[PDB]
Structures are given as C-alpha cells and as structure tokens.
Amino acid sequence: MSHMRPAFGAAWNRFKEVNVNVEQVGKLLGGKVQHNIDAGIFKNACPIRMSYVLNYCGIPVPSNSKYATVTGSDKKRYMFRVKDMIAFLPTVLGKADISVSSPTPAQFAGKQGIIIFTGHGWLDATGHVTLWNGNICSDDCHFLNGSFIPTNATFWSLK
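The structure corresponding to this sequence follows.
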C-alpha cells in the first residue's frame, strides 16, 4: 500500500503562511504555542511550522506518547521538538525516497518535496525540516547553518 502525500503546492502555500521567526510564529498561531514561545520554552519555530503545514494539508498531528504536542488557538496539535517531527514524518509518508550522507543540492536536482537535514552543532545532534522546490528551500537549506554541520539529508517527493 502506498501512503498519500500532501500536494507540493498546498504544503508550499501553508509554509509560506508561517515563514517568519519563532516569536512571530507564536504571535500568529496564538494560544499555548504563543504562550510557550513568549515564555522561552519553545525556541525552535521549525517543528511548529511543519506541524501547521501537516495539519492544514490533511495530516492531523496525533495525540501520541511519542510526540510532544500542545495546542494552538485552533485546537489543533503542534509539535515543538524537531526530533519528534523527524520521527513522525516516515510514519505518515512512508519510507523516504532519498536519504544520503554528506548532503549536497546536486543529489536533489529536479526534485520537489519535504526535506530533513540532520547533523550536529558543537554540543548536540540537531536537525531542520523544510520544503525544497528543486532550487531553494522554503526557509533555509542545510547542505554542505551558523555552526551546524550537516551529515544526512532525507527527502520525500511531493506532487
């Protein structure tokens, strides 16, 4: 069985709607998301953005012990840890079309879809989830960052 995936256009459009800095993202999504953003408890906009994209493209973020979630003023669930979004994606999209070490844009030429860049900073492993249109990311790509060294890119095509 194949898994349904969001249309690339719709995903790109919702993402555009939330492509601002974290505090502006809270100031937009309202509710407990905004509260935790203003408190300094949520500092990463990335999983919240991606939660908004998935929620409004018809993949509702679940109520599950595997994923840390709060609610926005829309009563929909939002993840706020990037590792959780990263784990969540294959469970709904199926296995990635591409996963490569030492990621460069050449490996994704002529492709469009959801892309996860993982790697490490000076102290911890981390990641970034975004959209890729064949030339740019919807916010920032992390190909071979501040001081973030990318070691993998994992990617699903969207139509």
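The longest helix spans residues 82-93.
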